[PDB]
């Protein structure tokens, strides 16, 4: 009864110091305070924990909550607690074990007196505020602290060496602050219990200190977004419980530790965007691996066959390296591959036939390699695909029938190969198709009418093929179509006359075909058309005056059968090359019409 009274009064006093526009604390306005929202009590009915996470509360830190004599846990995670932290705010909070002030609006410095006022803390988070000035050196006096998270503030100076004295720490998160360029303090190697070290975006320079080899309980080492130099040290390989290594966007050089293969516990490894050389380690037994990213390095040699031992692998991004050889033939048969990006390497041989064996593959990105042979019919049934980029390889044969109509396929990029065949009518199934990029192949036959039913299409790019027959009238009501490029084909017939459907058409390129008829007047009323190339066809009649409405980066009507006069806006000799090779055409200058 006495404790319920005490508790209720202190909680209400604290609440009076806050604004509650969401009415999150309506229960604090008949019932025991032990059953109020966010409030937990011990068996003597004293408040032990207040958790107001995500309650949309506004105002200064509610110091009054610390007057609850048994309060051990306080969370104000994700509110609008504002102003600054004063020394005084925490004077009475000395019983706290847990304090979470993350994701608020706090500004100013961390009080230097905080460890003295909060000497029992095991858990301190003040991530995602606007804290400035340095991390106080007094933080080295915490005797019990297990986790410290100051990530995502504007803290500056350098990481204090005294944090190495807090040998109870298991997690140290200081990522995304505004520190001066400095080395990781050697003294952090004294934190021999550390499981998480997150110093991403900390302006770190120099090598990973050798003392960090004493952190044998590391589970997550994340030093991303710094300018760390030298080798990735081979001691990471001997961490018996390591699950995640994140070292991307640094200046690491040398090779991947040769014994990486034995890291059976490793789930995620990313050393992308460094200056690594040499090979991917072989004899991989990476049983728990989910993600391997090594893109934008200078790696050479093959993808080892032993990658196929990673039966939970879902992400493999190796793009922009100097990797060579054939891919392991079994890649993806036994892995839930989701994102595969091996672009800009020198891989050869066939695309592994079961890359989508488990039906999870979303991105297949293989641009700029020397892959050859045909696309497996398997991929024709890979219904999870959203993004396919196979351009600039040595691929051939017919595309699998179902590939054209995959239901989630957004980008279909096949350009600069030697594919043959006609586009089937089953392209009608590609409901999500945004970009069709198939230029520079040997595709034949007519562009199917059904492409006009795919309302989301923004790009149809099919230049340098063997397409023939007519442009389907249906293309003309693709309301979102931005780029139409069917240059260098064998297309015939006319351009449709009614083009107001093409409100987003920026580029119309039909150069080098067998197209005939007049240029429709409505070409000039297209509101965002900046590129118009109708050259090397058999267009006849007069150049519509509406073209003078457009601001064209490219206008090319050369090598046609056009007649009459050039529109006056283009009468100057600098435009002449836009109209060459139209015997019937002339320019009106000074009275006479000149060829």
């Amino acid at each position: 009864m006495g404790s319920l009274n005490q508790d209720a009064t202190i909680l209400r006093q604290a609440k009076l110091g806050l604004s509650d526009p969401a009415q999150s604390l309506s229960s604090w306005s008949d019932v025991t305070p032990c059953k109020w929202l966010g409030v937990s009590c011990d068996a003597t009915s004293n408040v032990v924990s207040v958790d107001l996470s995500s309650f949309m509360l506004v105002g200064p830190f509610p110091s009054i909550l610390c007057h609850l004599p048994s309060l051990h846990s306080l969370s104000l995670y994700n509110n609008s607690i504002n102003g600054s932290l004063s020394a005084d705010d925490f004077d009475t909070c000395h019983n706290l074990i847990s304090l979470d002030l993350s994701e608020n609006l706090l500004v100013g410095s961390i009080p230097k007196s905080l460890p003295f006022n909060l000497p029992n803390l095991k858990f301190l988070e003040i991530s995602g505020n606007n804290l400035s000035d340095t991390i106080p050196s007094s933080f080295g006096e915490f005797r019990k602290l297990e986790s410290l998270n100051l990530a995502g503030n504007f803290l500056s100076g350098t990481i204090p060496a005294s944090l190495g004295n807090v040998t109870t720490l298991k997690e140290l998160k200081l990522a995304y602050n505004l520190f001066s360029p400095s080395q990781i303090p050697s003294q952090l190697g004294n934190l021999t219990e550390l499981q998480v070290l997150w110093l991403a975006g900390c302006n770190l320079v120099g090598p990973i200190p050798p003392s960090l080899s004493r952190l044998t309980s590391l589970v997550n080492l994340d030093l991303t977004f710094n300018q760390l130099t030298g080798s990735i040290p081979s001691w990471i390989t001997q961490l018996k419980t390591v699950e995640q290594i994140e070292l991307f966007n640094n200046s690491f050089s040398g090779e991947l530790p040769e014994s990486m293969g034995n890291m059976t516990t490793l789930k995620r490894f990313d050393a992308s965007m460094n200056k690594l050389t040499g090979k991917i380690p072989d004899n991989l037994n990476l049983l728990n691996l989910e993600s391997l990213n090594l893109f934008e390095n200078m790696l050479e040699g093959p993808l080892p066959e032993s990658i196929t031992r990673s039966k939970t692998l879902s992400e493999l991004k190796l793009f922009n390296n100097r990797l060579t050889g054939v891919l392991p033939s079994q890649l993806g048969a036994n892995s839930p591959l989701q994102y595969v990006d091996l672009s800009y390497n020198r891989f050869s041989g066939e695309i592994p036939a079961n890359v989508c064996g488990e039906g999870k593959l979303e991105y297949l990105i293989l641009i700029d390699n020397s892959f050859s042979g045909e696309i497996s019919n398997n991929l024709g049934k890979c219904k999870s695909l959203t993004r396919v980029r196979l351009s600039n390889n040595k691929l051939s044969g017919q595309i699998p029938h179902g590939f054209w109509g995959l239901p989630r396929l957004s980008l279909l990029e096949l350009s600069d190969n030697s594919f043959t065949g006609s586009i089937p009518k089953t392209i009608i199934g590609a409901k999500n198709l945004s970009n069709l990029r198939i230029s520079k192949n040997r595709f034949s036959g007519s562009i199917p009418n059904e492409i006009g039913s795919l309302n989301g299409i923004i790009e149809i790019s099919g230049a340098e093929n063997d397409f023939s027959g007519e442009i389907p009238e249906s293309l003309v009501k693709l309301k979102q179509l931005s780029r139409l490029d069917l240059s260098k084909n064998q297309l015939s017939g006319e351009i449709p006359r009614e083009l107001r459907g093409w409100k987003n058409l920026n580029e119309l390129n039909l150069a080098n075909n067998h197209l005939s008829g007049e240029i429709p007047k409505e070409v000039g009323i297209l509101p965002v058309l900046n590129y118009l190339d109708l050259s090397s066809n058999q267009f006849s009649g007069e150049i519509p005056l509406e073209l003078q409405n457009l601001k064209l980066n490219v206008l090319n009507l050369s090598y046609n059968h056009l007649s009459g006069k050039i529109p006056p806006l283009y009468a100057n000799k600098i435009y002449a090359h836009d109209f060459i090779g139209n015997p019937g055409l002339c320019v009106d200058l000074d009275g006479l019409c000149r060829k």
């Binding site: 994701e103 991530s127 995602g128 991303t224 793009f319 991105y363």
Partner: peptide, 12 residues
């Protein structure tokens, strides 16, 4: 908020 401790999402 803050970028998570996780893999780079960059891709072609």
């Amino acid at each position: 908020p803050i970028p998570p401790s996780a893999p780079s999402k960059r891709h072609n």
